[PDB]
């Protein structure tokens, strides 16, 4: 009897909605309206890395806040030195259709993936003096969209087959898989404790996973279009997403509901990246309007603008110590702001 | 300074190698091969001799690169921007089907990224299409047709119906009824690519 199942599912959804709405006594704006603003923020470029040739898509920082990594459609994956604008490595790829790159926290491995449905791992501390492929991970049915390191032995990967998996590099076997989504998964963020992670797909929804046990704990259904970015709050009890609706929203894990929206009438372009600050007061979000914006987290108003790119800002990132912020673009250029 | 001059020399060598590699690799033409299912793409690809298949060959001192992305069952909007700056498209249509092909062609021609990219059109399976049109008329799929029941008029009607979906004067479409021939597809592609590169050079020089 599918009718009874649908009716009980609808009843459960209504009960969930009522319970969620029963704990909304106040809002963030009313509490926060009694604090001083931050004024205006003026940032200027300091470095310009010009080595790539076509449409850099992904970038990532290192744990020492001194080394970078970049990937482009030209088929090259090179790592930079921010302080002296130098090049220290240059790794050629078998497939030129790459979309992601990750840096291991220890600094011994780098990973990349793309349209070939394969995640590759490179070793940077070989005794022969050259970087060589260590393992090739396969098993996904669709394209890859993100990859983050947990330690020097296991990795997490989100793909376009509406699924996520946890791997073991020592043997190349998919340990645990995660199912429950409907559309293509595009974003993935890791908690500071490395015991939970959230993801967002194209069905205008997001959910939290447990690494130890492959179960889903909560679900959020705020936006109305495809989610493209996600990032945990530095405290670890909140996160902010970004969609093609030209909006950004903040969610709370303990309350399980939205708190604020970041939108303006003069912005129509979508969001391609999102990042926080060291204290969590600032929020940086790249746009399709060839520029980026800085917004107050607790006040929901614009507090600056960054210009200088002639194409899409496809990636963003902030150092561990919060010293600088890096931006990448389709114009094959990288900039460091302070 | 310190021994950092060795690192500077390493960076200079890396930059020189990158420039040389880019110059060497910037001398090829890339083509997309979008189409329908069971449209005959594999047959012509093999005749010309899960992820992405990239077959390539050399004809008359020109290096080609063909990309087939039919193995991925996902929304096309997610990865259609990756194939920008492509020279042309090799859209293929079978005459023995068809509405899905027209819908896909209309969607492709009206895309924002491909507003200034030429399209080569191929119509396969001419002999068995003639046999079928002898067996049954074209009114089964095109009730609005009013002409006779021969082959040339039906081919012209189908070509006109496919061509009418264009909405940009800057686009050029090259139609062709291959009839499962041999050693003609390369010539047609070569002529089209020659025209495209001549136009691109004229535009780059400032004469457009």
């Amino acid at each position, epitope marked *: 009897e599918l009718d009874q199942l649908r009716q009980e599912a609808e009843q459960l959804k209504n009960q969930i909605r009522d319970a969620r709405k029963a704990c909304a006594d106040a809002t963030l704006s009313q509490i926060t309206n009694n604090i001083d603003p931050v004024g205006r923020i003026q940032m200027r470029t300091r470095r310009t890395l010009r080595g790539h040739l076509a449409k850099i898509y992904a970038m990532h920082w290192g744990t020492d806040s*001194r*080394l970078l990594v970049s990937a482009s459609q030209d088929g090259k994956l090179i790592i930079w*030195d921010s302080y002296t604008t*130098n090049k*220290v490595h240059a790794i050629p790829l078998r497939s030129s259709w790459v979309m992601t790159c990750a840096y291991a926290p220890s600094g011994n491995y780098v990973a990349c993936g793309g349209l070939d449905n394969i995640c590759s791992i490179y070793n940077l501390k070989t*005794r*022969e*003096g*050259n970087v060589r492929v260590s393992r090739e991970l396969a098993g996904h049915t669709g394209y890859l969209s993100c990859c983050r390191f947990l330690d020097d032995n296991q990795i997490v990967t989100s793909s376009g087959d509406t699924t996520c998996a946890l791997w073991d590099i020592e043997t190349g076997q998919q340990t645990t898989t995660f199912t429950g989504h409907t559309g293509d998964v595009m974003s993935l963020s890791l908690a500071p404790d490395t015991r939970l992670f959230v993801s967002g797909a194209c069905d205008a929804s997001a959910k939290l996973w447990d690494v130890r046990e492959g179960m889903c704990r909560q679900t959020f259904t705020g936006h109305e279009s495809d989610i493209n970015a996600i990032c945990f709050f530095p405290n670890g009890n909140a996160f902010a997403t970004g969609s093609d609706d030209a909006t950004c929203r903040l969610f709370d894990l303990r309350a399980d509901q939205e708190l604020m929206t970041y939108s303006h009438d003069n912005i129509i372009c979508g969001i391609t990246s999102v990042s926080f600050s060291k204290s969590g007061r600032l929020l940086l979000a790249g746009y399709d309007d060839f520029n980026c914006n800085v917004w107050d987290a607790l006040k929901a108003d614009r507090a600056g603008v960054l210009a200088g790119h002639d194409n899409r800002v496809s990636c963003l990132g902030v150092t561990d110590d919060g010293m600088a912020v890096a931006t990448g673009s389709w114009d094959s250029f990288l900039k460091i702001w302070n | 300074s*310190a*021994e950092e001059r*060795a*690192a500077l*020399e*390493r960076s200079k*060598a890396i930059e020189k190698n990158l420039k040389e590699d880019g110059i060497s690799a910037a001398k090829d033409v890339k083509l997309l091969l979008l189409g329908a299912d069971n449209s005959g793409k594999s047959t012509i690809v093999k005749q010309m001799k899960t992820g992405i298949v990239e077959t390539h060959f050399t004809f008359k001192n020109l290096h080609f690169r063909l990309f087939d992305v039919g193995g991925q069952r996902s929304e096309r909007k997610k990865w259609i921007h990756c194939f920008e700056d492509v020279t042309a498209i090799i859209f293929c249509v079978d005459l023995s089907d068809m509405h899905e092909s027209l819908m896909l062609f209309d969607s492709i021609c009206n895309n924002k990224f491909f507003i200034d990219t030429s399209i080569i059109l191929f119509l396969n399976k001419k002999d068995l299409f003639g046999e079928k049109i002898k067996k049954s008329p074209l009114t089964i799929c095109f009730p609005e047709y009013t002409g006779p029941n021969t082959y040339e008029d039906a081919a012209a009607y189908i070509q006109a119906q496919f061509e009418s979906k264009n909405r940009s004067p800057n686009k050029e479409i090259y139609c062709h009824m291959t009839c499962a021939t041999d050693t003609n597809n390369a010539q047609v592609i070569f002529d089209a690519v020659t025209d495209i590169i001549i136009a691109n050079n004229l535009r780059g020089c400032g004469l457009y």
Partner: single-chain antibody, 233 residues
Framework: DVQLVESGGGLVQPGGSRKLSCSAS????????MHWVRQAPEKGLEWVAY????????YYADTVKGRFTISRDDPKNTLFLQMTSLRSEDTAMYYC??????????????WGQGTTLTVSSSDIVMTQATSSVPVTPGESVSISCRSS???????????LYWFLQRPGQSPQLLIY???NLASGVPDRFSGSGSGTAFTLTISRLEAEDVGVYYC?????????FGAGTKLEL
């Protein structure tokens, strides 16, 4: 399996000329520099020549300038050293060392074996005020070095190295840049210093740590070594 084998040793009359070869097999030769450290029969190590990757820069010792040449054959993976007008002070054992230079690299990682050569009849000074010291198993020892000019650069890096040469063997690298431990060395060894004074700790001394220790600087291209300290059980 990194390996370096040398050939071209023997007896040379005064005023002659010879050549030395260094064959490499097991690593990327084109991305490494070359050095030609030599050792007297009963004395310390001395530096001779340097060949950069790509044959761009070549440096020579002031004692043999205008008298020797260094060249590299990348396709054949060989290193050459052509010397002319050999004198009576050129008798020594010649070593073949490799090094790579980038942010985080460890130069002087691997050393060759060495070939003998017998002939018939504005600088930085590193001082080691110790020549012999007795030790016992399970105890701790300390070695000190000093320099005339401070090795602490503006960027914050100190250029000091420590080496150990077991009897009848080839020297290896233990500590580079005064704080970093080389790969494969145990954790019993640690180094520290400030300015023109440095110290090495050999706590938990076993029977495999007997030899001579050397301290070297890499601030100026005329590289200089020390006298060394002997540690006998």
């Amino acid at each position: 399996d990194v390996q370096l084998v040398e050939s071209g040793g023997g007896l040379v009359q005064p005023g002659g000329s010879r050549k030395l070869s260094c064959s490499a097999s097991g690593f990327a030769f084109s991305s490494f520099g070359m050095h030609w450290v030599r050792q007297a029969p009963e004395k310390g190590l001395e530096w001779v020549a340097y060949i950069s990757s790509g044959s761009g820069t070549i440096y020579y010792a002031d004692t043999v300038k205008g008298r020797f040449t260094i060249s590299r054959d990348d396709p054949k993976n060989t290193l050459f050293l052509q010397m002319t007008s050999l004198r009576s002070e050129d008798t020594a054992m010649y070593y073949c060392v490799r090094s790579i230079y980038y942010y985080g690299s460890s130069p002087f990682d691997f050393w060759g074996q060495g070939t003998t050569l017998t002939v018939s009849s504005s600088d930085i000074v590193m001082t080691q005020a110790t020549s012999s010291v007795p030790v016992t198993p399970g105890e701790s020892v300390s070695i000190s070095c000093r320099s005339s000019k401070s090795l602490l650069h503006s960027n914050g890096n100190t250029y000091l190295y420590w080496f150990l040469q077991r009897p009848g063997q080839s020297p290896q690298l233990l500590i580079y840049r005064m704080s970093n431990l080389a790969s494969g060395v145990p954790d019993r060894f640690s180094g520290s210093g400030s300015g023109t004074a440095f110290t090495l700790t050999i706590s938990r001394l076993e029977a495999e740590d007997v030899g001579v220790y050397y301290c070297m600087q890499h601030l100026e291209y005329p590289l200089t070594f020390g006298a060394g300290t002997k540690l006998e059980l």
